[PDB]
Design an enzyme around this catalytic site. Structure first.
Site, PDB file in Angstrom:
ATOM      1  N   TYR A   8       2.713  -4.212   5.950  1.00 37.50           N
ATOM      2  CA  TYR A   8       1.504  -3.838   6.668  1.00 37.50           C
ATOM      3  C   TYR A   8       0.277  -4.396   5.964  1.00 37.50           C
ATOM      4  O   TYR A   8       0.180  -4.237   4.763  1.00 37.50           O
ATOM      5  CB  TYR A   8       1.491  -2.311   6.695  1.00 37.50           C
ATOM      6  CG  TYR A   8       0.603  -1.650   7.738  1.00 37.50           C
ATOM      7  CD1 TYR A   8       0.951  -1.703   9.088  1.00 37.50           C
ATOM      8  CD2 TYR A   8      -0.493  -0.857   7.377  1.00 37.50           C
ATOM      9  CE1 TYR A   8       0.220  -1.004  10.040  1.00 37.50           C
ATOM     10  CE2 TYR A   8      -1.238  -0.182   8.329  1.00 37.50           C
ATOM     11  CZ  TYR A   8      -0.877  -0.244   9.655  1.00 37.50           C
ATOM     12  OH  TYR A   8      -1.562   0.425  10.642  1.00 37.50           O
ATOM     13  N   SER A  54       8.319  -4.079   2.258  1.00 36.93           N
ATOM     14  CA  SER A  54       7.732  -2.833   2.756  1.00 36.93           C
ATOM     15  C   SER A  54       8.119  -2.635   4.232  1.00 36.93           C
ATOM     16  O   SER A  54       9.318  -2.595   4.516  1.00 36.93           O
ATOM     17  CB  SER A  54       6.270  -2.811   2.397  1.00 36.93           C
ATOM     18  OG  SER A  54       5.766  -1.480   2.536  1.00 36.93           O
ATOM     19  N   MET A  55       7.170  -2.567   5.178  1.00 40.25           N
ATOM     20  CA  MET A  55       7.505  -2.485   6.603  1.00 40.25           C
ATOM     21  C   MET A  55       8.314  -3.712   7.042  1.00 40.25           C
ATOM     22  O   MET A  55       9.094  -3.623   7.988  1.00 40.25           O
ATOM     23  CB  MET A  55       6.259  -2.365   7.490  1.00 40.25           C
ATOM     24  CG  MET A  55       5.714  -0.982   7.609  1.00 40.25           C
ATOM     25  SD  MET A  55       4.388  -1.085   8.843  1.00 40.25           S
ATOM     26  CE  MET A  55       3.978   0.623   8.567  1.00 40.25           C
ATOM     27  N   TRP A  64       9.952   0.069   3.482  1.00 41.71           N
ATOM     28  CA  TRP A  64       9.264   1.201   4.083  1.00 41.71           C
ATOM     29  C   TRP A  64       9.887   1.362   5.478  1.00 41.71           C
ATOM     30  O   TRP A  64      10.068   0.384   6.210  1.00 41.71           O
ATOM     31  CB  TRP A  64       7.776   0.872   4.161  1.00 41.71           C
ATOM     32  CG  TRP A  64       6.822   1.931   4.682  1.00 41.71           C
ATOM     33  CD1 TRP A  64       5.874   2.596   3.940  1.00 41.71           C
ATOM     34  CD2 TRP A  64       6.634   2.383   6.048  1.00 41.71           C
ATOM     35  NE1 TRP A  64       5.134   3.438   4.738  1.00 41.71           N
ATOM     36  CE2 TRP A  64       5.580   3.339   6.027  1.00 41.71           C
ATOM     37  CE3 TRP A  64       7.260   2.114   7.274  1.00 41.71           C
ATOM     38  CZ2 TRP A  64       5.142   3.991   7.181  1.00 41.71           C
ATOM     39  CZ3 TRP A  64       6.798   2.729   8.416  1.00 41.71           C
ATOM     40  CH2 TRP A  64       5.760   3.662   8.367  1.00 41.71           C
ATOM     41  N   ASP A  95       6.314   2.654  -7.231  1.00 44.63           N
ATOM     42  CA  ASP A  95       5.783   2.422  -5.910  1.00 44.63           C
ATOM     43  C   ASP A  95       5.239   3.732  -5.339  1.00 44.63           C
ATOM     44  O   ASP A  95       5.972   4.713  -5.274  1.00 44.63           O
ATOM     45  CB  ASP A  95       6.906   1.927  -4.991  1.00 44.63           C
ATOM     46  CG  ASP A  95       6.438   1.314  -3.684  1.00 44.63           C
ATOM     47  OD1 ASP A  95       5.434   1.796  -3.126  1.00 44.63           O
ATOM     48  OD2 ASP A  95       7.132   0.412  -3.186  1.00 44.63           O
ATOM     49  N   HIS A 124       4.146  -1.299  -5.986  1.00 40.80           N
ATOM     50  CA  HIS A 124       4.652  -1.661  -4.658  1.00 40.80           C
ATOM     51  C   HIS A 124       4.820  -3.178  -4.443  1.00 40.80           C
ATOM     52  O   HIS A 124       5.672  -3.589  -3.635  1.00 40.80           O
ATOM     53  CB  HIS A 124       3.701  -1.093  -3.613  1.00 40.80           C
ATOM     54  CG  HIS A 124       4.149  -1.233  -2.199  1.00 40.80           C
ATOM     55  ND1 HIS A 124       5.401  -0.840  -1.746  1.00 40.80           N
ATOM     56  CD2 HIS A 124       3.465  -1.699  -1.137  1.00 40.80           C
ATOM     57  CE1 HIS A 124       5.457  -1.095  -0.438  1.00 40.80           C
ATOM     58  NE2 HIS A 124       4.288  -1.621  -0.030  1.00 40.80           N
TER      59      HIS A 124
HETATM   60 CL   LIG Z   1       3.993  -1.705   4.546  1.00 40.27          CL
END
Ligand SMILES: [Cl-]
EC number: 3.1.1.101
Length: 263
Positions: free
Chosen positions: A59, A132-133, A157, A178, A209
């Site tokens: 993101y 992540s996403m 994520w 993270d 992260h």
């Molecule tokens: Cl993210």
């Protein structure tokens, strides 16, 4: 004799190095189809068709966050597409769709005589990665498309951590400190949900992260592991079984777990 095996017999040293054996070139995708933008990294001299990997950022993030993987992987014999999403605020499912659109476009260019990657790809052998996403999107891609040969998200994520259907070999990179996608509530429960696959959990000590992103201080270890995983599972290359499955015995790693992964 394995038809997909490429390159010389690996060593820890060769996998920890800046680059593998093959010359890498890159190009910008001029007309991205179903995603925002893309860069394709490819070996000029792999000695045979290679698999394709699509890599998605998190993101708010763009290709710069994840694109160190492009040359690193491509130099060991993969075609790699790093994308920007249609919006920086795309959610995981959208990211998955875009990741598979990227793979599709790589297959299109493999069949396009004017493309630098004409005839360089084995479109039956594909992998997914992302941060992540984009990591969540990779796991969603794996769940929805079990013909994918490997999945290796970083600091994943997702709003739901249950990936119990996944049969794709999955290596999860996690970053110990993270605060965005906490290991204990995201990466680990994801890992623990999967009972049907070869799987691995590698947690980088003290990592924020962004611990597996471009410019990180653990490129030797992280790149060794990413390349070994993709080689073992995308190419069925048992020269890489130990590198893929072993505890790396590194003071840079604060938690290591693996299952259905024999050295
Ligand atoms: Cl993210």
């Amino acid at each position: 004799s394995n038809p997909y095996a490429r390159g010389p017999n690996p060593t820890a040293a060769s996998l920890e190095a800046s680059a593998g054996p093959f010359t890498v070139r890159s190009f910008t995708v001029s007309r991205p189809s179903g995603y925002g933008a893309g860069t394709v990294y490819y070996p000029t001299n792999a000695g045979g068709t290679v698999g394709a990997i699509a890599i998605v950022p998190g993101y708010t993030a763009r290709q710069s966050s994840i694109n160190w993987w492009g040359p690193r992987l491509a130099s060991h014999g993969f075609v790699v597409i790093t994308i920007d999403t249609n919006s920086t605020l795309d959610q995981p499912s959208s990211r998955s769709s875009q990741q598979m659109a990227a793979l599709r476009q790589v297959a299109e260019l493999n069949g396009t005589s004017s493309s630098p990657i004409y005839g360089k790809v084995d479109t039956a052998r594909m992998g997914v990665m992302g941060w992540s996403m984009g990591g969540g999107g990779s796991l969603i891609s794996a769940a929805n498309n079990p013909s994918l040969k490997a999945c290796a998200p970083q600091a994943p994520w997702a709003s739901s951590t249950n990936f119990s259907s996944v049969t794709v070999p999955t290596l999860i990179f996690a970053c110990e400190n993270d605060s965005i996608a906490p290991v204990n509530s995201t990466a680990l429960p994801i890992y623990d949900s999967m009972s049907r696959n070869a799987k691995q959990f590698l947690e980088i000590c003290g990592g924020s992260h962004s611990c597996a992103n471009s410019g990180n201080s653990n490129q030797a270890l992280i790149g060794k592991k990413g390349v070994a995983w993709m080689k073992r599972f995308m190419d069925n290359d048992t020269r890489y079984s130990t590198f893929a499955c072993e505890n790396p015995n590194s003071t840079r790693v604060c938690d290591f777990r693996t299952a259905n992964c024999s050295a």
